[PDB]
Design a protein around this ligand. Structure first.
Ligand SMILES: O=c1cc(-c2ccc(O)c(O)c2)oc2cc(O)cc(O)c12
Length: 238
């Protein structure tokens, strides 16, 4: 992810087949002649898409030009959470499935995985970061406190940001309960709140290299969103 001063990001296509699939997902959803109500509503929850981009002298080098969802914030606190029971897609080989499950074997049980976080601390005027090994260390016993850490700043637990995140996730959950045409594997939610209010909170769906046509409810995604909502709700009682 390359942050651009004009409030966009450039996301380089992943190697094939993943990058090409993500490009086609954004192209399908943001097609100018699309009047599918399901896809028009989905646009609200994604970063705005500005099309494929490549450097003027390098047509080989492929990026997606996307809205930087952190751009309106002064000291953005950012958390990325992978959603679902399965990180592997319906056409994964046995080895691929094993690779994905071994990255975090609690995915089926918990339904989400914290990929990372960046939290502004007011007392020190500094950021605390967690990498992928943080989230992969969390279990049923530690997931509540693991998620809570994201909302520790301003000398307090930011229950305003927690409640706002629940309210934003609930709209995404409602979209998922009103569509049976896409299933999403290894996709994420990006959470942003203001570290420097309820509060400017942003919750956006990202990472679409494993989105497939479906005939059913995305049950794993729904389970993960619900569990994540339940965890967030329990943090409101702290
Ligand atoms: O707007 C986006 C903003 C970010 C982002 C910005 C700053 C960070 O410190 C970070 O960890 C992620 O990451 C994205 C990643 C995406 O795949 C799509 C996006 O629109 C964004």
């Amino acid at each position: 992810i390359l942050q651009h001063p004009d409030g966009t990001v450039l996301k380089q296509l992943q190697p094939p087949p993943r990058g090409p699939r993500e490009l086609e997902f954004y192209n399908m959803v943001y097609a100018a002649d699309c009047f599918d109500g399901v896809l028009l509503e989905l646009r609200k929850y994604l970063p705005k898409y500005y099309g494929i981009w490549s450097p003027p002298t390098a047509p080989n080098d492929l990026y997606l030009k996307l809205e930087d969802v952190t751009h309106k914030f002064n000291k953005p606190c950012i958390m990325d959470v992978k959603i679902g029971q399965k990180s592997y897609d319906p056409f994964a080989s046995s080895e691929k499935i094993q690779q994905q499950v071994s990255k975090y074997p609690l995915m089926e049980e918990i339904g989400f995985l914290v990929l990372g976080m960046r939290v502004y601390h007011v007392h020190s005027d500094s950021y605390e970061t967690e990498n992928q090994h943080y989230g992969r260390s969390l279990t049923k016993e530690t997931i509540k406190d693991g998620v809570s850490r994201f909302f520790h700043n301003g000398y307090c637990l930011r229950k305003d940001a927690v409640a706002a995140s629940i309210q934003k996730i609930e709209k995404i959950l409602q979209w998922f309960e009103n569509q049976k045409q896409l299933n999403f594997y290894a996709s994420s939610l990006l959470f942003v709140y203001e570290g420097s209010s309820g509060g400017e909170v942003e919750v956006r769906m990202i990472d679409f290299a494993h989105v497939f046509p479906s005939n059913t409810i995305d049950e794993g995604y729904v389970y993960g969103l619900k569990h994540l909502i339940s965890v967030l709700r329990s943090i409101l009682d702290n």
